[PDB]
Amino acid sequence: NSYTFIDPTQLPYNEKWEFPRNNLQFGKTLGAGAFGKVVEATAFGLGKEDAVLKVAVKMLKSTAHADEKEALMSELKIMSHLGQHENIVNLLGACTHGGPVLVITEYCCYGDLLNFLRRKSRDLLHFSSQVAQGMAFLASKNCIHRDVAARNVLLTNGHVAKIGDFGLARDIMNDSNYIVKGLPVKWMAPESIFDCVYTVQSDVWSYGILLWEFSLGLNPYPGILVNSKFYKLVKDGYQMAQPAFAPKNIYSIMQACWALEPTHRPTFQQICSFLQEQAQED
Ligand SMILES: COc1ccc([C@H]2COc3cc(Cn4cnc5cc(C#CC(C)(C)N)cnc54)ccc3O2)cn1
């Protein structure tokens, strides 16, 4: 499959990415938490060609210390080593010198998917494929994502979906989908919950939950509270039912992804292929 020659969370920053903040006028804030945020902006003469364009910049709020200010650099560092892919929110550059860290990304003009679906309560299949392609890539670099969900999928011009992660620019603290456990429990594989284990095979599970998000944006395990009862349910192998708008084949993928044995679950490679077949038949 893929061999990892190096791990990017232990590599230093690559200064080829650096871009000068003076060619950057902040537009509107796009999203924010209690430790950092994300805001529209125009980068003057970006890339190896002197072209202006629209971007998003992630950055710390006032309230950051060695915990978060590092975790932004980690994200920066990890990101400099994946490099581009149409189905991913790509790093364009950074500002790491002469001020707090500014991480400049593609601006995805239609924002998060969970809202794009909730808004609108073959198109559903493209989204699934595109997200699947993006994860197959992250998988090919042995990069575990840990927060695969519709809230973290973005929609650029021509409704192409790219995986991302809002990280510090999301109010995780005031978001009931993230449970305090001395975590987005409804999206997590059992090995991730019970045993703090986190693989690409876990991310397939979470990618299962994302497909069920074909419910056109429903909260998983609808009306089920996260508590003793919910953990037993998922260990004893309970599965959400088929969504209304799911083709049977597609629910077969979800049930595949929600296999309790991590190895019995498929790979982003397989899913992309099964998705490719089901495309011309539609
Ligand atoms: C594991 O790999 C990755 C890949 C990308 C990322 C990061 C990159 O930084 C990001 C930056 C963004 C921010 N972003 C880009 N276009 C955006 C558009 C909006 C919006 C909106 C509207 C439609 C106007 N309401 C909000 N945030 C945007 C979203 C996801 C990110 O994921 C993290 N890990």
Numbering used by the authors: 559 to 679, 753 to 813, 817 to 847, 849 to 917
Excerpt from the publication:
CSF1R is a type III receptor tyrosine kinase expressed on microglia and macrophages. Colony-stimulating factor 1 receptor (CSF1R) is a key signaling node in microglia and macrophage biology. In particular, CSF1R signaling modulates proliferation, migration, differentiation, and survival of microglia and macrophages in health and disease. Upon CSF1 ligand binding, CSF1R dimerizes and undergoes receptor auto-phosphorylation.
